[PDB]
């Protein structure tokens, strides 16, 4: 009938023209959100090393590799 088909094509144009919001804010924020937790966990280790008077080599860190180098 040629009238239903173009409606489908137009609706395909309607849906497949979806506007993608800038999700990069979420990923960057969450990736930083994890890092502060990782960097913040070493605060007590550094302070305990500081308050005991130990040297840089004498401060043992329980730090392990993470997917982000930060």
């Amino acid at each position: 009938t040629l009238i239903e088909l173009m409606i489908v094509v137009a609706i395909i144009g309607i849906l497949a023209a979806i506007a993608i919001p800038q999700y990069q804010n979420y990923i960057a924020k969450s990736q930083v959100s994890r890092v502060m937790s990782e960097t913040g966990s070493l605060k007590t280790v550094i302070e305990t090393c500081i308050l005991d008077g130990k040297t840089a080599a004498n401060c043992e860190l329980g730090w392990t590799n993470s997917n982000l180098l930060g």
């Binding site: 500081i50 005991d52 008077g53």
Partner: protein, 69 residues
């Protein structure tokens, strides 16, 4: 081990030899002490007439009421 010579470097004994001079027991922080108070010291002095008193060069907020002089 004695007043003249001690077994620890950070502790020195000021032993008087006359009746008109005072005695002092000085203790200097180090090693396991905090980095902020690493180079400070606390001393205990005795006047000839028999009064003991305490003094220290550490920061005021680190000074307890016992040596608040």
């Amino acid at each position: 081990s004695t007043a003249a010579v001690t077994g620890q470097t950070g502790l020195t004994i000021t032993y008087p030899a006359s009746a008109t001079e005072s005695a002092a027991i000085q203790g200097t922080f180090g090693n396991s002490a905090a980095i902020k108070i690493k180079n400070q010291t606390l001393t205990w002095t005795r006047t000839p007439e028999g009064a003991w008193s305490c003094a220290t060069t550490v920061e005021a907020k680190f000074k307890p009421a016992g040596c608040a002089s």
